[PDB]
Symmetry: D3
């Protein structure tokens, strides 16, 4: 008798704060390297999740898979069944904005999308997928204390990684979207539904237009930077 | 000599920071009561605008009329022709959230809408009308310094004041929309287009569901609180 | 205790026929220059309205502001609270039709739009914003009696004055839209809702494509013609 | 080698004015009873068309079938290949409006629809399918001369005769749509495209809501009245 | 009193299997040349329908007119009032697929559309208009036994014969749509609603892209082949 | 240098026929229990994939994760980079159809969806996500050979596992959708784009309306029946 169809953890096995990334093997890397006394609490569908502490405060980390439907399943369950209060997505993104650089960590204030899931929640109208202000502020303040450069602004969550859509990148750049990814627009409205909190921070792994990609060391530095920001933010939340 | 079809002001007559409200007569009240050395710089269409200083820093205040098309005209012109860098909308709103109370100040992080103007900017997709983070932060910090409680969260900008739409308020409440008004979803994407900043702060003048309305006395107090917050925030911007 | 949130007029203070234009100062010019014994009946938000007589018939004139949400507020109130029976919008427009010229007055039979307000009235379907036939006929017949040439046909009401939409003008021209403005599509469905009458007459102030503008002299001549047409039509309604 | 895929008539075989009804056997009845020197000029797909004179004026009559796609084929061809200048649809309709009574003649000023064909012509926006004003006026004046009462107003053209859509009739009634049928919203924009004229006149054969239906005698009398109005109107066009 | 508004047939007059084509004169040709003892059961609006036998099994054939609204009327009535169990549409189509050739028989597994009728059945979502598998298989096996090559795949049902839509033919070709016609996407969901069966078989009369058209003789050969396939399939259904 | 961002396999590591299920641990179970000489060819993101032979025929099996965006990534890569020709999804589903029962095997002919990805492929129109007929037929014939009853018909692929949508189940049931799942509508159009083949077979693990759920014992039996049907079908393709 599993608590959810997608998660073998028992109620209480997840901390009130959860970091989530798309790759479950990355969740394990975070738990093994940054958490104290981490225990694996889920492996259903290989979607590894862990719970331990960071500087004495309980903290969990878990994979969410790729795309809005996948993160919607895991986040709904975490808020509803596991009584999680705060989820921070930590991920990678592409960028179309020339002012955004690979060494920039992107702190997401809101996310647009080409999915229908939010129109369906608000009678077909425009529903902004909006990060919680305390979470954003904790991330901004942590990056400043750590002397890590950031960009703060809008993400765009797409259902199609292999985009064929002409004019999209130009419009995203015109309105200064800083990150293109695939999940955050699904996370924020679920947090709203449960009266809980969510945010998102992403590292830039490539310039979508120029097709220039970040080097392995740039990815290492930005990943460490992002994860240090997120972990410190958890102490304020 | 009309610099724009809707504004007789000369280039340079507006400060880089502008407070805007719907009622041009309220803009005049703000200029007369809170600005030093305010001079009227526009009266086309009766949409009064003024420029003076607040605690020594140049500041303008101007009416924007009712609805997304009206504020879009004035804000597009201010950013493009008058080289304004920051617009803060100051207004009243209704609330559907039982946790928001009349006489509460609402600071807007993002705004939904039933307008089509943002779909038309982003190839028909979901484009969240999102406030600039430094503007939100300045408003939140000023309200804290003044010991004024705030709600920080989503607004909903409607085209239709006299709504006939069943189920809408219930959906807005379920996802913890804090403010219902008519303009901010039109302002924020224009600020994006010009690489500039915008935000919005509103006082709650009625609970849409319960139909409880703020007394004239409550409205006066909440307007005074809100305007002091916005004015103090301009010093940080 | 104001009769509406946007209008200090008492019931009865408005005549059954009202001319409306976007600019309240132009409403004042019409009242002062063409109405006999005009009285100001509203100044809330600077949205001036007046009531007098024209050739013995009571007649009012009032501004409606810019855009569909603004005219919707004022027209809903006039039909509902003030029991107005006929509103004729008088305005200016742009043209894309090479057959329409600046010396032409445009009498609007129906208006398209990029707004969502009419889809929301009819379960998402196409709802044509349609002028009342008796009002259209009165305007056409008055222009003939005054020997003023007119174009009679479709308008297009846009939410965005500063349009960036490619291909729009070409389609409008292909289907012989005679006028581009910003309000009439919101007015006609509200008249329908209250079982009342509405129409629209506009002067051509510029060719959108060439960016050709009417001279100030041409504007004054066409305004005098349009107002002469509208005032005479009120005698037939 | 047929002039079109759907019409064996030669160019010139159609008069510049055409009456069209849905039933080709009704077109034959009109030709046999009201036209002089009539000859059949089409029988492709049983869609009978005829050309003769009415009181000295050349006139054709032809069936158009059921639904927007069907009338769109025939009307496009008549305007483009056969150089027709005016089409008047003559038909029956259902009504939801309590002020409209069975055996009332309905003269259509514009038509709504649940079809996509007009969004596709105007970049997804609202395109009002609008009758030509001279055609409308000619119909109104003809009925006036024959002392036949008329309703003048909006129709609604649906793709689905067998509606299952809850709330539609109530919305149509709220906004005083006078006629529900299946074709006119497809006709008027095609006329626009070719710089030509179109109109529609319908008799009420039933009350959709109450299911009160017109008797056979009411049907014959209302058809006789309608067709005389349409024929007399052609003399002014 | 007619059993339906569009059909004078009495209950029982239609066999449980009906072939339908757009042209009622083609339905008469099929009845005269391939059915034994055919009886005309409808001629309302010239939409001829017939009932006889094919190799001892009862079979009907009837016209459906042009477009989704027209077939929807006739098919709903046949399934609902006349208790028909299986309808097979027999027709012609255009092709965009370079692998499909004039005189190729296309058996339709599903059909896309630019109509709104199926979104209106499934809360605005994507509802695939899908042929019944036993009907598809019966057609496939009959063509094999007759040694007639077939293409099996998707059709696209358009509301607009005279297309002006740029990019449509390329997208249809990109996704291997094999047939462009105007009715099947309206037929299949009505069959679903009544728990009944439907299919479609079409012959390619022209390449829409290359504009190659089938010769008059090739059309007769391909019609004979298609009709032979359909009649044989009824023996298995 | 990985052949794709999501797959470490080299080109040639995948067989031309691939079975895909959502759970990567189920793919491993399939490979270990039914494939001879299975080799792991991918483990990126824990999304295990394997290649071996089934009764001498090369066959791969791999997880696709949850939701249309996830399967779209993996399927696009398999067809485009790895030159796969046939993908069969094997899964579980819920049903709303009163004729479908838990432990029923469902073979999917076409899939509806609430996702936007297929509208974006076909100019906003209705694009039916349609299984390849040869694949459907092979699955149907295999189930017949094994004496396993099957239901053949429409699926519905949703983005939202935790549905809150009123009326959806009733409409799905009215039009006899037999299976509700989350991926197949994304798979079929990608196969089309690449000129390749796709299908789907699912076992019913619960009735959404009656809330009957299959026992763990019934689930294993239905999984075993389904997988044997799919494996045998690959020998015919």
């Amino acid at each position: 008798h599993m608590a959810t169809p997608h998660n073998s953890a028992k109620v209480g096995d997840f901390a009130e704060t959860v970091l989530m990334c798309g790759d479950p093997l990355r969740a394990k890397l975070i738990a093994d390297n940054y958490l104290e006394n981490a225990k694996q609490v889920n492996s259903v569908r290989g979607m590894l999740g862990f719970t331990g502490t960071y500087k004495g405060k309980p903290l969990s980390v878990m994979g969410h898979g790729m795309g809005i439907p996948s993160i919607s399943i895991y986040a709904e369950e975490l808020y509803n069944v596991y009584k999680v209060k705060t989820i921070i997505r930590v991920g990678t993104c592409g960028t179309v904005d020339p002012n955004v650089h690979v060494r920039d960590v992107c702190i997401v204030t809101a996310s647009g999308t080409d999915s229908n899931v939010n129109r369906m929640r608000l009678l077909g109208h425009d529903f902004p997928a909006t990060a919680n202000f305390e979470v954003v502020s904790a991330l901004v303040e942590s990056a400043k204390a750590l002397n890590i450069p950031t960009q703060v602004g809008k993400a765009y969550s797409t259902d199609i990684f292999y985009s064929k859509e002409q004019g999209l990148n130009e419009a995203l750049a015109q309105y200064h979207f800083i990150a293109v990814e695939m999940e955050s627009a699904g996370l924020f409205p679920i947090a709203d539904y449960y009266g809980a909190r969510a945010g998102c921070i992403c590292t830039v792994s490539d310039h979508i237009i120029t097709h220039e990609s970040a080097t392995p060391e740039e990815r290492q530095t930005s990943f460490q930077n992002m994860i240090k920001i997120a972990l410190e933010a958890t102490l304020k939340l």
